[PDB]
Amino acid sequence: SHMPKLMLALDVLDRDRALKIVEDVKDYVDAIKVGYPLVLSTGTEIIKEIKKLCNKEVIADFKVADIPATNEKIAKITLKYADGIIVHGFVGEDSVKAVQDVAKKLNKKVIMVTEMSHPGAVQFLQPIADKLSEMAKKLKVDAIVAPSTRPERLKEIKEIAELPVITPGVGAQGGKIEDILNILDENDYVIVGRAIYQSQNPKEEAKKYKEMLN
Amino acid sequence: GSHMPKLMLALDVLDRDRALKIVEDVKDYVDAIKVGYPLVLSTGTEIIKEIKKLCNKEVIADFKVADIPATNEKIAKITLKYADGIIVHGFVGEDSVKAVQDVAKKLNKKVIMVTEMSHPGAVQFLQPIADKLSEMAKKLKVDAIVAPSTRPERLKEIKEIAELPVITPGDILNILDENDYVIVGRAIYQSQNPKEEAKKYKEM
Numbered sequence: 001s002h003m004p005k006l007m008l009a010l011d012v013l014d015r016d017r018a019l020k021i022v023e024d025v026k027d028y029v030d031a032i033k034v035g036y037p038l039v040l041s042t043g044t045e046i047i048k049e050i051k052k053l054c055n056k057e058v059i060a061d062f063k064v065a066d067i068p069a070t071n072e073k074i075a076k077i078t079l080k081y082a083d084g085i086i087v088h089g090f091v092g093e094d095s096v097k098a099v100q101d102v103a104k105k106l107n108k109k110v111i112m113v114t115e116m117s118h119p120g121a122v123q124f125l126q127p128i129a130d131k132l133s134e135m136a137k138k139l140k141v142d143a144i145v146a147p148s149t150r151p152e153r154l155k156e157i158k159e160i161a162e163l164p165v166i167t168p169g170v171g172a173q174g175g176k177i178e179d180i181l182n183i184l185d186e187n188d189y190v191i192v193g194r195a196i197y198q199s200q201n202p203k204e205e206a207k208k209y210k211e212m213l214n
Numbered sequence: 215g216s217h218m219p220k221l222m223l224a225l226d227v228l229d230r231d232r233a234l235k236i237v238e239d240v241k242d243y244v245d246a247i248k249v250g251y252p253l254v255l256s257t258g259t260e261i262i263k264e265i266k267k268l269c270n271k272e273v274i275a276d277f278k279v280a281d282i283p284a285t286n287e288k289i290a291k292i293t294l295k296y297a298d299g300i301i302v303h304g305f306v307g308e309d310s311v312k313a314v315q316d317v318a319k320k321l322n323k324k325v326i327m328v329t330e331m332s333h334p335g336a337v338q339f340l341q342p343i344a345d346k347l348s349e350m351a352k353k354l355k356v357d358a359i360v361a362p363s364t365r366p367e368r369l370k371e372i373k374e375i376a377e378l379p380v381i382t383p384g385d386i387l388n389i390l391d392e393n394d395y396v397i398v399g400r401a402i403y404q405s406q407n408p409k410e411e412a413k414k415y416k417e418m
C-alpha cells in the first residue's frame with residue numbers, strides 16, 4: 001500500500017556488468033541511480049543504453065555543484081537520457097533553479113541533496129541541513145536525498161521538506177533498516193546498492209529487497 | 215613573487231572536434247587547459263586523453279567533486295588517469311577532500327579546492343564560510359585554490375589566509391605571481407584566431 005519504491009544504486013565501473021545487472025533486476029527495481037564513476041568512462045551513452053533496456057526511471061547522481069550557466073549545460077546533456085538529476089543545494093538557489101528550468105521543459109526531475117552521512121558532512125553541510133530542506137520546499141524540487149542513519153532525524157526531514165525522500169533502505173552490512181518503512185510512503189524511495197550489484201544473482205537479491213518493503 | 219602568472223584556458227565548448235582544434239591552435243601559448251563536465255560527458259574521458267596528447271600541457275578537470283569519500287576516490291581515479299589535476303569542493307568536508315588527495319598523491323597529480331564562488335547563489339551558504347574553507351585548504355595542503363577575482367582586495371585576503379596558489383578569472387595581476395593561474399575562456403575559444411588571442415593574453 002504505502003510501500004516505498006526500490007532504487008538500485010548501480011555503482012559498478014564496467015558498462016557490460018552494469019548492463020547485465022539492469023537486465024537481471026528490471027522486474028523488481030523501480031528506479032536505477034547511476035553516478036560519475038560509471039558514466040565517466042564512456043559518457044552518457046550508457047544512460048541511453050540502460051534506457052533501451054529496463055523501461056524504469058534512471059536518475060543521475062551527479063551532485064551538480066556549479067554556477068548557473070554550467071549547471072544548465074550539465075543538466076541539458078544529462079537529462080537527454082536520464083529521467084532525473086541530483087543536485088547540491090549548498091551552491092545556492094540560482095544554481096538549483098538553473099537545473100530546474102532545464103528539467104521542467106523536459107518533464108524531468110530535479111532532486112536536491114539536503115543532508116549527507118559521511119563524517120566530513122558534520123563540519124559545514126550538517127549545520128545547514130534544515131536550511132537545505134527548507135530551500136528544497138521553497139523551490140519545489142521533485143525530491144530530496146537524505147540519510148536514514150537516524151529514523152527520528154528522517155522524520156524531521158520529511159516534516160520540514162514535505163517532499164519525497166530518497167534514502168538508504170539498508171545499513172552498511174546490507175540488512176534492513178528498522179523503523180523507517182513506517183515513515184516512508186509510495187512516493188519515497190529506498191536505495192540498495194552493493195548487496196544487489198555485488199551478487200552473482202542480482203535478480204534474487206533485488207527480489208528479496210523489494211519484498212522487504214512488504 | 216613578482217613574475218607573471220600562468221595562463222589557463224577554460225575550454226568551455228561542447229563539440230569534440232572544435233575542442234581539439236582549439237587546443238592544437240593554442241598549445242604553445244597556454245600553460246594549462248581546464249575542462250568541465252559538459253565537454254567530458256558526451257564521450258567520456260577519452261577526450262582528456264586526446265587533449266593531453268595534443269597540447270602536452272597541464273590538463274585540469276573542473277569537476278567540482280562533491281561526494282562521500284568512497285565515491286570521490288572513484289571519480290579521482292578515473293579522472294586523473296588522463297588529467298593532471300582535479301577541482302574539488304571543500305564544503306562537503308575534510309575526508310571527502312582527503313580521499314581525492316590520497317589518489318592524487320600516488321600519481322604526483324594535483325588537487326585544487328573551491329573555497330569561494332562568485333555567482334549570486336554563493337552568498338547563501340558558501341560565502342559565510344569562505345575564510346574557513348581557505349583555512350581548510352591550507353590545513354590539508356591542497357595544491358591550489360579556486361577563487362574569484364571580482365574584488366582584487368578580497369583575492370589578496372584569500373591568498374594571505376591560504377598561502378596557496380590561486381586559479382582565478384582574468385589590476386588583478388599585481389596580486390598574483392608565477393605560482394598563480396589566470397583563467398581565460400570565451401575571449402580565446404570563441405575567437406576567429408584563438409592562437410592569436412592566446413598569444414596576446416600570454417603577453418599581458
Ligand SMILES: [Cl-]
Nearest residue numbers: 192193194195
Ligand atoms: Cl547495499
